Chains A and B, each alone.
Chain A
């Protein structure tokens, strides 16, 4: 089995923006 997932937590880096 798998534990209940966590709510969002702080992220170290911004996702790169490709545009």
Chain B
């Protein structure tokens, strides 16, 4: 018999809420990336999004070890010649604190269409409140 494949019209996607408060950035990102792809379900299929919707609360309070708070540097190029921009971790947390979790998770998700679709199920917030009460998100300790 042929090996089971998940079907993207008969899959069970569950809603989870995670508090990032004092959570190491990377060690949190791996678990998010593992639960966004679907690597924790027996139905896991590399060509199908079988992962869960995760709400990440308090992204501004995410923890990094060593001197990474001042020393970790996020580089992006604008596309214009000489347009190499950089923000430190603290500058990223001061200005756009959602991006630090999002950038960390995006780099740990498969690259290509499906990987981009997986990332769409990650709902990151800066404060302690989200707008997704309707989806009845279960608490997930990571």
Contact flag (A, B; Cβ within 8 A): no
Partner-B contacts on A (CB < 8 A): none
